[PDB]
Design a binder for this molecule. Sequence first.
Ligand SMILES: *c1ccc([N+](=O)[O-])c2nonc12
Length: 13
Amino acid sequence: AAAALAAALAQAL
Ligand SMILES: *c1ccc([N+](=O)[O-])c2nonc12
């Protein structure tokens, strides 16, 4: 889950 989210945020920004 950590990675999923990490990646989400990365993309968002
Ligand atoms: C999660 C998984 C892979 C990568 N990546 O840089 O290839 C990520 N970057 O930020 N979160 C992830």
